[PDB]
Paper text:
Calcium homeostasis modulator 1 (CALHM1) is a voltage-dependent channel involved in neuromodulation and gustatory signaling. CALHM1 is the recently identified member of a large-pore channel that permeates ions, including Ca2+, Na+, K+, and Cl−, and small molecules, such as ATP, in a voltage-dependent manner. Furthermore, the ATP efflux through the CALHM1 channel in type II gustatory cells and the subsequent purinergic signaling has been shown to facilitate the perception of sweet, bitter, and umami taste sensations. Our studies here showed that the human and chicken CALHM1s have a conserved structural fold, oligomeric assembly pattern, and a phospholipid-filled hydrophobic pocket for controlling channel functions.
Our structural analysis revealed that in hCALHM1I109W∆ct, the hydrophobic pocket retains a lipid. Here, the tryptophan residue forms a stronger van der Waals interaction with the lipid than the original isoleucine residue. The Ile109Trp mutation that upregulates the channel activity binds phospholipids more favorably at the hydrophobic pocket, indicating that the coupling between the phospholipid binding and channel activity. This density was not observed in the cryo-EM structure of hCALHM1I109W∆ct in the absence of RuR, supporting the view that it represents RuR. Moreover, the structure of hCALHM1I109W∆ct in RuR-free conditions does not clearly resolve the NTHs, indicating a higher degree of conformational flexibility of the NTHs in the absence of RuR. We therefore suggest that the TMD1-Ile109Trp interactions, lipid-Phe19 interactions, and RuR-NTH interactions all contribute towards NTH conformational stabilization.
Author numbering:
A (entry chain H), B (entry chain G), C (entry chain F), D (entry chain E), E (entry chain D), F (entry chain B), ...: 25 to 79, 89 to 139, 147 to 256
The structure:
């Protein structure tokens, strides 16, 4: 929920500017596509109250179920982030602009990969001959949205299969897991109210021992 | 409700830009009309709490009714998305711009399909002779809205027929289905409160066994 | 209420653009005036909880009353939509622009019906001689608002007559109808609470039969 | 309340454009001043729950009082609409622009009534000689606001007189009217709860007769 | 409260345009200063629930007190309206612009009163010689704000005196008035609940007499 | 509270325009600094429920205390208004612009006091020689803010002294005052409920005497 | 809280304009940095309900503790105001602009201190030779933010030390202080309810003595 | 929470302007990156209610645990501030602009470090030869975002490790700590209600001793 809402609204606040240099284009875009997905995965494992308990008095089946159910909810931000990035076209445009068919709809090996690398940067682009900048753009942003929809499809067709076979699920392990998660909470609330009554008997003997001073 | 509201507000956030190339126009528009409808269908089956139970101790009539009633609610986003796409004209304009009567209200086979393909792109369009760009536009966007209203009509005239004959419906199967859906919930709430009382008797023996340490 | 509010706010979101062609003008405007009214009528019959029950153990008088009262509420969107369309003038301007007195306040049969057809389109209009475009506009939008007020009047003078004679109404049939509509609801709420008690006696025997496994 | 709020906010949404033609000016303005007041009167009679009951077992004095009190609340929109229309000046400007003193603060009978008729239309007005357009405007909009304030005065000085003499009022008829309006409501609420208990005894015999099927 | 809030927010919605003609200036401004104050006075008498009761079984002292206390609350809009009108300067500028010292800080009797009358109208003003238009303005709007503050002072110094002597007040008449205003309300609430019990005994005999029809 | 909030938000709604004339500058600014403070003082005395009771059965000490505590709360708007007026600089700029050192940072006695008087009016100022208009401004608005801060200081250093000595205060008179203010309220609430029970015994005899008419 | 929120939002409403004169620059900025801090200190002492009680029956230790705890909360606005003023740079720019190294990154003693003094005033600055105005600005606003951060650091490193040693604190004096602050409140609420019962016995004898008049 | 929200919204209110001078660039940026993180750390220790209690009757293990858990929550603002500063590029651009490869994608040692230092300042930059200013920018802002993501990764991969080994944690010390934190609160609430009852017995003897004065 909030994790998935902070994944799409964290994309618009982060500015994508790319170097438009013939070697840094691909390296910069590969890392601004893979790293923040990997950060939203670890930030979903860290922030549920079972990461330490799995880190023995519990059956191996109950651990395997309680682990695989832990990861599957961490995969909602890593998937919503990669989809909004491919449906935008900025990351795909910078990484692949240097390899575009200039003969169809359109100098050594250098002087051309250095000219084509400035396509995503409108104020730097000089070579408006050999290619209109809006013809190379608007063609790489369509190949990017064909992949952004093939990813949402194959990913939704896979979350459907893991609700019909339900691997790593047995009713014996699903029941034993739901019981132990209840024992955790009740033992907590019982401990607190036993701490606020064994202390309240020492409070009354401390106050009247300190009400000895300010009464004379 | 929310599924249908996320279907119309997901259309304005997604930008439709099309390639304006004489072969990619039709392929790009066919997929930006069919794929996200197919994604909103699977995303409605996956997110109701009966997809696994249907995946035997239950009568075949009760399964067939509980299945056909499951799909019919998944068809509200796929229909609202295809209707708003045809009532906008952008998808129809790009896919059919290459085949427009240039003699009425108006070079080899090439040099013409490549000139006509840039009609939806105002900054790329060169051939302002042989056709005004706002005369070819404003004529394809009217054929698109005649189909967008013929689709809302024939689709509303079909949701009316399936409320008067009510196929795959019998009162015997409608009653048996509503009963089993109640047994699911009551067995759930009875299980939990039996788990928070069989554990609460072991809590009191654990706390005083751990209140053995911090009292001496 | 909501149906009537979704009828006026659905008019501003839908863009009226017309072809300004000498044959498509009238056909396009006739269908963008008649079809969405017909869609809001069927969408009011479909969405009340009596369309199937009327589709025999009930008196014929009670059916006729319960039918005619069903349609009269479906007529609030079809009337509010046709009124806002005539009080705007866009639909009337495109359908009748080709037949306007050019002699009063102002070439074969063609070259004139093709010149006059571009009046509603300001960027396409060439023939600024023989007619100022704002003189032909501002004269068709006044004939359109005389009809838009004659329609709201004759329609409000008819909803007044069907509250003073009240056809298809008898106190015998109005009373029998209000009773059967109460029997529908009470039989529903009685069925549910009988389903959550006959099942709750089988739940207790299932849980302790499944509390046999995770206790040893 | 709401009727009076929908009367002033319905004036700003409706656009006043007038033909600026030497014969349609007066006819168009006479109807855009008289018709929507007449529509707000019938729309206040239709929408109170006594229009049918007055359409005999009741004294003639009680009917006359209950009728005259019915109309007086329907007169709050027809008066607020005519006042906001005269305090704006647009309707008065178009209907009387053709008859303005051009000698004071300033061609056959035609060529002058056709020149003066375009005063309310700034883009059509040609005859900027013989009259400045803002001198003929700003003089007809002051005669319009002297009448708009003489109407609010004489109308408020009349609602004051019909609260001090109180015609068609007698304490005998005011008391008999307030009693019959209470008998209407109590007989309604008594009928419903007698319909949900005579039916609830047939529900229990229908459910267990339909709980005969899904129990074996 | 609301009357005083509708008095200041009704001033900004009403547009002050004045004729800038040498005879209509003073007449137009005298009436747009005196009439709407007189309308807000009668609209405060009409809308309190004692205007008819004063229009005999009650002592003359109790009537005189209950009348003079009735007017004093009607004087809050007539005073807030005249103050905001003088603190704005538009009404004072148009009525007195024709009589301004043109020798200090600066043609027959006509040709001068007709030139000076267009000072409040910036687009009509021709005589920018003999006077700068912003020098005649900005001098009449300062004499207008010296009077607008002398009016708020002498009016607040008078509402202070009528809270220290308190004319037309005696404790005998203030007590008799507060008692009769309580007898009005209690006799109302006692009448209603006596009307909903004498009718409820006839309802039960009507329903079972009409439950005679729809039971056989 | 509200009085102090209506004192600062009443300053921005009132427009300060000054005459820029060599004699009206000082008189206009002296009155737009002193009068509205004097109006907010009398408007705080008038609007507390003790102004009449002080206008004898009460000790002289109790009156003197209840008077001096009455004024001190009326001094919060007169002080917040004079401070915001000096911290703005407009009033100080117009009243003293005619006497500014034109030799330092820079014609008879006239022709100079009439040239300097137009400094606060940017569109009227002619003498841009002998002085830049933004050099005479920006120097009078700094002397105005040195006085606006010396006033807030000496006024806050005086509200601190009258909370440490507390003149016109004795605990005998503070206690007698708080008691009489309680007797006022309790005698009020006791009077009302004695008026709604001595009248309720006459209501029952009036209703059944008027239920004599509409029952036969 | 509110005092600290009114300290930062009172800075943006007050306009900093400085004279840009070679002697008034430093004096104006020294007072617009020191005075409003001193006003927010006295305005925090005045507005807590202990300033008079400290102005004897109470131990000297309890007074010293209750005084030093009184000042420490008055220091939150004086510190937040001086920090936001140094982190803005306007006050530092005007006071030190006259002494800036014009040789590094760049006429008698006069003609130079009078040229440099107009740096903070962009419309007055003439000497754009010998110095770019944005080079002298942007260098004084960096020395101002190095001091604004050294002040927030040394001030936060001092509020940390006075929470670890806690001077003027003893548990005997902290306990005696918290008790006397409770006796103040309980003696207040006990006094009031004793004033509304000794008066309520005289009310009943006054009302029936005044119900003697309006009953005959 | 609020500390972390005041860390990111305090970054946009503080303006980063840098000197663009060849020696102040690095010193200014090193301090606007390190100091406010150090201020948000001390401002998190100071504002929790245990900083004094740790400044002996408590076991050493319980102190070490209660200290290390105190710091870890103070590290959420210092980490969110350093991350948003590196993901923006302004601090990295000014500190390293003087050392940029001008040969790749592009005078003594001086005249070059003084030319390159003005890159972050667009209005001061002169040397648009030898380097385009948007080519040196857009290359330093990409090296800055590779470090801003390597910091969020290595910092999130470290908060994951300290939730799986959990150093400085033992269940004996975690239990003893949670108990003492409960004894603190209960001894507080017990002290107050013992102070409002030992005082309430002296109040009744003071009031009637002061009700001796104002009763005679
Ligand atoms: C506010 C929202 C913003 C608006 C929307 C914005 C538009 C977004 C548009 C569309 C988004 C729609 C996508 C939905 C997909 C379902 C999510 C999912 O997968 O989890 C499912 C797992 O199922 C899987 O195992 C599939 C995961 C495949 C691995 C992908 C790795 C991701 C990193 C890519 C690396 C490759 C890099 C290479 C890239 C070329 C969970 O299964 P479940 O049945 O739900 O059970 C859990 C129940 N629960 C849910 C209750 C916990
Ligand atoms: C916030 C909203 C946004 C604002 C509005 C925006 C404007 C939108 C304007 C107008 C939209 C109005 C349309 C309403 C239609 C009814 C929906 C429906 O069909 O479901 C009905 C099924 O009935 C059917 O079976 C018909 C479906 C036909 C198959 C269509 C496939 C869709 C993919 C096309 C592929 C072809 C591609 C080729 C294209 C050329 C459900 O029947 P029911 O009786 O309701 O029973 C269920 C009860 N329930 C509802 C309680 C569950
Ligand atoms: C948020 C709102 C937006 C703001 C306002 C926007 C401005 C709108 C301005 C003005 C709108 C005001 C109009 C009000 C009219 C009343 C409605 C009505 O008719 O129903 C009445 C039926 O009465 C009839 O039978 C008359 C219908 C005539 C047939 C018209 C067909 C419509 C399609 C035209 C095809 C022709 C095409 C050719 C065109 C040239 C109902 O009667 P009732 O007594 O009420 O009883 C029901 C009780 N109930 C109401 C409780 C259920
Ligand atoms: C949100 C508001 C918008 C803001 C304001 C906008 C600015 C508006 C400014 C100002 C408006 C102020 C006007 C107020 C007048 C009172 C209303 C009234 O008349 O009803 C009174 C009737 O009294 C009458 O009988 C007088 C009616 C005269 C007939 C007029 C016909 C109207 C059509 C003209 C055709 C002529 C065409 C020719 C034109 C040249 C009711 O009397 P009552 O004592 O109240 O008793 C009822 C009690 N009740 C009220 C509880 C039910
Ligand atoms: C929403 C707000 C807007 C935002 C802020 C805007 C920025 C404003 C900035 C700053 C304003 C801060 C000023 C605060 C001063 C305290 C007020 C005061 O004085 O009352 C104190 C009286 O104390 C006195 O007696 C001093 C009054 C001196 C006389 C001044 C006359 C005023 C007219 C000038 C004529 C000279 C003309 C010549 C001019 C050259 C009250 O004392 P107390 O101890 O409080 O006891 C009462 C308790 N009580 C408060 C509960 C009732
Ligand atoms: C509204 C928000 C704004 C929107 C977002 C904006 C975008 C932000 C994007 C991304 C931010 C995501 C980062 C999250 C990291 C976790 C925080 C953390 O570290 O604390 C963890 C400690 O764990 C550690 O010990 C690691 C700290 C390393 C030391 C860093 C020093 C910081 C100063 C750098 C100096 C170097 C300078 C040199 C620089 C080159 C806490 O561990 P825990 O397991 O949680 O246990 C505590 C439980 N608790 C949490 C309940 C208390």
């Amino acid at each position: 929920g909030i994790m998935a809402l902070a994944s799409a609204q964290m994309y618009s606040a982060f500015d994508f500017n790319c170097p438009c240099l013939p070697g840094y284009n691909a390296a910069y875009s590969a890392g601004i596509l893979l790293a923040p997905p990997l950060v939203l995965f670890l930030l979903g494992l860290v922030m549920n109250n079972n990461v330490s308990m799995l880190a023995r008095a519990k059956d191996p089946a109950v651990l395997r179920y309680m682990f695989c159910s832990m990861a599957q909810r961490a995969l909602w931000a890593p998937v919503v982030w990669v989809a909004v990035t491919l449906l935008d076209g900025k990351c795909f445009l910078c990484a692949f602009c240097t390899a575009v068919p200039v003969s169809a709809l359109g100098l050594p090996a250098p002087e051309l990969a250095r000219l084509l690398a400035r396509v995503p940067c409108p104020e730097i682009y000089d070579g408006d001959w050999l290619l209109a900048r809006e013809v190379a753009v608007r063609y790489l942003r369509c190949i990017s949205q064909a992949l952004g929809w093939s990813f949402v499809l194959l990913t939704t067709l896979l979350a459907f299969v893991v609700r019909s076979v339900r691997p790593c699920f047995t009713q014996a392990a699903f029941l034993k897991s739901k019981y132990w998660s209840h024992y955790i909470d009740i033992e907590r609330k019982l401990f607190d109210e036993t701490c606020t009554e064994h202390a309240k008997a020492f409070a009354k003997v401390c106050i009247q021992q300190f009400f000895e001073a300010m009464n004379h």
